[PDB]
């Protein structure tokens, strides 16, 4: 990826996979599942 | 052990008679069963972690068991200092613990949050926010000033706190007289233990009632209403003599519910959210008054940072800042809590006695849909503030830096990307002399690049204010059933070219009407968000002094007075700005986000292209506060984000191409 973002990335040793101390960390981002304005807690599973 | 004569030791005076009655009571408290415990373990141990439960006693006793630790010690008086994750928790228990230590708060004991320095010379125990600890590191390194740093409430996980067990870990590995003490309300399987190399552990036993747990029978459509009904249902049905505690996401939210409950009871209720004055937040300790009972319809705050109270409404969910960075997204969401969240809950109602907590979902639910734990901060953040005081502080290797999550690859990247853009790291990751002044500035990279960057269009004056005033709460005041007035009150301010400059004119009316409180009343403007906004702009100024930046207006009678500051806000916004579509949308340029104008701002039309300080991600996507710009000066001011050459081909970039192609004619 071309992106500078990237590259200054790479220019800190990254190599492919998750950061931290042993390269234990997420590989993609997370994500929060959206609230439908009030609807209560488990109304979007039926 | 050391003389104790039983004086004030900050006074040589004995202690006031309040002193020996709070001290009869903090006794009783389930840490001081451990203080002998305690000791042992801080005198032969340079790390360790301490588990209470709320209520038990640590954020009030264990600091100041570590400030007479400090005073036995030979050598100049360090101090101790100890973080909260809420600005509102560590104002409140430092004024409690100035009472215990028979002190006047700002002197032996005082508070540290951001644009709010209640300490001097004298003080000795510092509970201050974890974001401005971190701040601190940056002119300390080692962090010097302190010989006991205390991270309280760190099961929250915020990332202040995540980054700060980092550096501490680093600190640790060079100063050997550092003490430092990781406090949290839950075991989380040892996590902090392993983290610290395997550090000793305190646990101190809970004292809470049984608490029984009511699962509605199936989902609710409307969270708020089952809220509502519950509350009432509670009031009468209930025979034992008990207070509520409600738990919303928001101040909105909650001012709308306290609204209908007292319509629907009338056919004590007490609000409490951060931005609420201290005057009305310290009514949630005041006696209640057919049994009458007292409802608290407060946010997470009261979750674990305080305590209060036998039955308990979990709706559950909480309003969190999330970061995409995909689409380089930032906003406050409403979200499911976690299995843990709503544990620590509903252990508030067993304070006093048995409780009950309503919560307002199923048991499978609760089971099979609710994470074990909240997400930590660090993995949904902007890292772009926090990679940017890492790097001031000297930490130049943030892929390996030992994180306890490390946050993924992608967010890292936008990080540096932010940063270089602005011009805060070269192509290198170096940090530059830019970038070291920004790292100063207690702002978004983004402001703090604006406000030094507008000392060129010579508006620094202006965007110095106008920076105030985005640091502070909401400055409109706009009652629920009073929007026409209020709306119409705003437009007063208006500036026909948006909304950064309106908070320019409130704040300029705000000084020449001399702090009036009937002003604010009579133009419906927060008179507490404006004497905020002036003292966090004279700190903000006190930076521009140290760095020699000066300080600079144009000509009010000039066309560019504001040309120049639409111009200056360019400098630190240029990537959140949209483009106007044919048919009225607008998207977002890059990352072609639908959007259309927060129903707040005062634009009267529709320009072509808008810069936003704000994105609100509800329903439908909201930008709010914007400012009318001319795409040329995008082009010319951040020619490096605005690079055609690696533009996405949408129709933001044609309209681009035709003013690039213009300028080369």
Redesign the interface.
């Given at each position: 990826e071309?992106?500078?973002?990237?590259?200054?990335?790479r220019?800190?040793?990254?190599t492919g996979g998750?950061?931290?101390?042993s390269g234990?960390?997420?590989?993609?981002?997370?994500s929060?599942?959206e609230?439908?304005?009030?609807?209560?807690?488990?109304?979007d599973?039926? | 052990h050391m003389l104790e004569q039983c004086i004030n030791p900050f006074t040589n005076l004995p202690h006031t008679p309040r002193y020996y009655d709070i001290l009869k009571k903090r006794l009783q408290l389930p840490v001081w069963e451990y203080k002998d415990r305690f000791t042992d373990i801080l005198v032969r141990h340079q790390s360790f972690v301490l588990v209470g439960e709320t209520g038990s006693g640590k954020t009030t006793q264990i600091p100041q068991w570590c400030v007479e630790y400090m005073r036995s010690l030979p050598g100049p008086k360090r101090g101790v200092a100890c973080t909260q994750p809420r600005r509102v928790a560590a104002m409140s228990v430092a004024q409690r613990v100035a009472d215990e230590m028979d002190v006047m708060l700002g002197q032996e004991v005082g508070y540290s949050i951001r644009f709010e320095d209640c300490s001097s010379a004298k003080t000795i125990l510092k509970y201050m926010t974890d974001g401005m600890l971190l701040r601190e590191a940056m002119n300390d390194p080692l962090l010097e000033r302190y010989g006991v740093i205390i991270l309280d409430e760190a099961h929250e996980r915020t990332l202040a706190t995540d980054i700060l067990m980092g550096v501490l870990k680093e600190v640790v590995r060079q100063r050997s007289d550092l003490k430092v003490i990781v406090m949290s309300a839950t075991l989380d399987a040892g996590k902090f233990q392993i983290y610290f190399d395997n550090c000793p552990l305190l646990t101190i036993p809970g004292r809470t009632h049984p608490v029984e747990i009511f699962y509605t029978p199936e989902p609710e459509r409307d969270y708020l209403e089952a809220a509502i009904r519950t509350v009432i249902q509670i009031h009468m049905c209930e025979e034992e003599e008990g207070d509520l505690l409600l738990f919303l996401t928001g101040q909105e939210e909650i001012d709308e519910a306290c609204k209908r409950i007292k319509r629907e009871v009338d056919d004590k209720i007490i609000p409490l959210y951060s931005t609420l004055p201290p005057q009305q937040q310290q009514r949630i300790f005041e006696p209640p008054p057919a049994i009458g009972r007292k409802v608290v319809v407060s946010t997470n705050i009261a979750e674990t940072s305080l305590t209060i109270v036998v039955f308990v409404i979990d709706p559950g969910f909480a309003k969190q800042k999330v970061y995409n960075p995909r689409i380089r997204v930032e906003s406050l969401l409403v979200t499911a809590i976690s299995k843990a969240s709503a544990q620590q809950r509903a252990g508030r109602a067993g304070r006093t006695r048995p409780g009950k907590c309503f919560r307002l979902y199923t048991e499978k639910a609760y089971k099979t849909e609710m994470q074990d734990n909240t997400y930590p901060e660090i993995l949904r953040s902007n890292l772009g503030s926090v990679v940017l005081q890492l790097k001031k502080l000297g930490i130049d290797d943030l892929v390996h830096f030992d994180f306890m999550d490390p946050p993924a690859p992608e967010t890292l990247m936008r990080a540096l990307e932010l940063l270089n853009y602005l011009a805060a790291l070269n192509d290198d990751g170096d940090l530059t002399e830019l970038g070291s002044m920004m790292a100063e500035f207690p702002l978004d990279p983004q402001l703090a690049k604006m406000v030094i960057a507008s000392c060129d269009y010579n508006c620094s004056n202006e965007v110095l204010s106008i920076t105030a005033m985005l640091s502070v709460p909401q400055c409109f005041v706009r009652p629920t059933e009073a929007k026409k007035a209020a709306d119409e009150a705003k437009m007063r301010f208006a500036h026909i070219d948006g909304d950064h400059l309106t908070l320019l004119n409130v704040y300029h009316a705000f000084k020449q009407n001399h702090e009036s409180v009937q002003w604010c009343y009579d133009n419906f403007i927060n008179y507490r968000s404006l004497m905020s906004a002036d003292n966090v702009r004279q700190q903000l100024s006190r930076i521009m002094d140290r760095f020699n930046l000066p300080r600079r207006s144009t000509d009010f009678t000039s066309r560019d007075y504001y040309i120049n500051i639409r111009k200056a806000l360019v400098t630190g916004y240029f990537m959140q700005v949209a483009h106007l579509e044919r048919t009225g949308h607008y998207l977002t340029v890059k990352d072609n986000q639908v959007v259309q104008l927060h129903p707040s701002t005062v634009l009267d039309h529709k320009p072509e292209w808008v810069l936003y300080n704000e994105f609100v991600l509800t329903t439908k996507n909201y930008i709010r506060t914007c400012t009318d710009i001319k795409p040329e000066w995008l082009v010319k001011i951040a020619p490096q984000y605005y690079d055609m050459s690696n533009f996405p081909q949408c129709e933001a970039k044609r309209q681009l191409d035709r003013i690039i192609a213009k300028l080369q004619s």
């Amino acid at each position: 990826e071309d992106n500078i973002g990237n590259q200054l990335l790479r220019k800190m040793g990254w190599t492919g996979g998750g950061l931290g101390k042993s390269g234990e960390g997420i590989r993609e981002p997370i994500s929060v599942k959206e609230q439908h304005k009030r609807e209560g807690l488990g109304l979007d599973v039926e | 052990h050391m003389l104790e004569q039983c004086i004030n030791p900050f006074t040589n005076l004995p202690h006031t008679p309040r002193y020996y009655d709070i001290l009869k009571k903090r006794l009783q408290l389930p840490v001081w069963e451990y203080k002998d415990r305690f000791t042992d373990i801080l005198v032969r141990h340079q790390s360790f972690v301490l588990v209470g439960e709320t209520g038990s006693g640590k954020t009030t006793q264990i600091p100041q068991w570590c400030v007479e630790y400090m005073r036995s010690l030979p050598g100049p008086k360090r101090g101790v200092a100890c973080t909260q994750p809420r600005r509102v928790a560590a104002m409140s228990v430092a004024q409690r613990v100035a009472d215990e230590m028979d002190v006047m708060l700002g002197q032996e004991v005082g508070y540290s949050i951001r644009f709010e320095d209640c300490s001097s010379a004298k003080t000795i125990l510092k509970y201050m926010t974890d974001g401005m600890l971190l701040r601190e590191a940056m002119n300390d390194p080692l962090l010097e000033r302190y010989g006991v740093i205390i991270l309280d409430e760190a099961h929250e996980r915020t990332l202040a706190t995540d980054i700060l067990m980092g550096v501490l870990k680093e600190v640790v590995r060079q100063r050997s007289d550092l003490k430092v003490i990781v406090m949290s309300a839950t075991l989380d399987a040892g996590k902090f233990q392993i983290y610290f190399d395997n550090c000793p552990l305190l646990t101190i036993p809970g004292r809470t009632h049984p608490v029984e747990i009511f699962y509605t029978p199936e989902p609710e459509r409307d969270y708020l209403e089952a809220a509502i009904r519950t509350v009432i249902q509670i009031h009468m049905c209930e025979e034992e003599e008990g207070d509520l505690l409600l738990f919303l996401t928001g101040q909105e939210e909650i001012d709308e519910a306290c609204k209908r409950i007292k319509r629907e009871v009338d056919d004590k209720i007490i609000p409490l959210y951060s931005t609420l004055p201290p005057q009305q937040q310290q009514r949630i300790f005041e006696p209640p008054p057919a049994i009458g009972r007292k409802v608290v319809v407060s946010t997470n705050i009261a979750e674990t940072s305080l305590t209060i109270v036998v039955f308990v409404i979990d709706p559950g969910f909480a309003k969190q800042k999330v970061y995409n960075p995909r689409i380089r997204v930032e906003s406050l969401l409403v979200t499911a809590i976690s299995k843990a969240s709503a544990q620590q809950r509903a252990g508030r109602a067993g304070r006093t006695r048995p409780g009950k907590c309503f919560r307002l979902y199923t048991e499978k639910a609760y089971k099979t849909e609710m994470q074990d734990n909240t997400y930590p901060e660090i993995l949904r953040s902007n890292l772009g503030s926090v990679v940017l005081q890492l790097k001031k502080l000297g930490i130049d290797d943030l892929v390996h830096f030992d994180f306890m999550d490390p946050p993924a690859p992608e967010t890292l990247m936008r990080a540096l990307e932010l940063l270089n853009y602005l011009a805060a790291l070269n192509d290198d990751g170096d940090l530059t002399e830019l970038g070291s002044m920004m790292a100063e500035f207690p702002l978004d990279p983004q402001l703090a690049k604006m406000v030094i960057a507008s000392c060129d269009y010579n508006c620094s004056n202006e965007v110095l204010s106008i920076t105030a005033m985005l640091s502070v709460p909401q400055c409109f005041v706009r009652p629920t059933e009073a929007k026409k007035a209020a709306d119409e009150a705003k437009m007063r301010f208006a500036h026909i070219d948006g909304d950064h400059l309106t908070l320019l004119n409130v704040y300029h009316a705000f000084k020449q009407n001399h702090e009036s409180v009937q002003w604010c009343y009579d133009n419906f403007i927060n008179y507490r968000s404006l004497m905020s906004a002036d003292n966090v702009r004279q700190q903000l100024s006190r930076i521009m002094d140290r760095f020699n930046l000066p300080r600079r207006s144009t000509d009010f009678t000039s066309r560019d007075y504001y040309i120049n500051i639409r111009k200056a806000l360019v400098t630190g916004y240029f990537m959140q700005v949209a483009h106007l579509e044919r048919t009225g949308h607008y998207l977002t340029v890059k990352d072609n986000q639908v959007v259309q104008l927060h129903p707040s701002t005062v634009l009267d039309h529709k320009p072509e292209w808008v810069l936003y300080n704000e994105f609100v991600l509800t329903t439908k996507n909201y930008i709010r506060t914007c400012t009318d710009i001319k795409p040329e000066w995008l082009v010319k001011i951040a020619p490096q984000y605005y690079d055609m050459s690696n533009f996405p081909q949408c129709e933001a970039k044609r309209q681009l191409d035709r003013i690039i192609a213009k300028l080369q004619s």
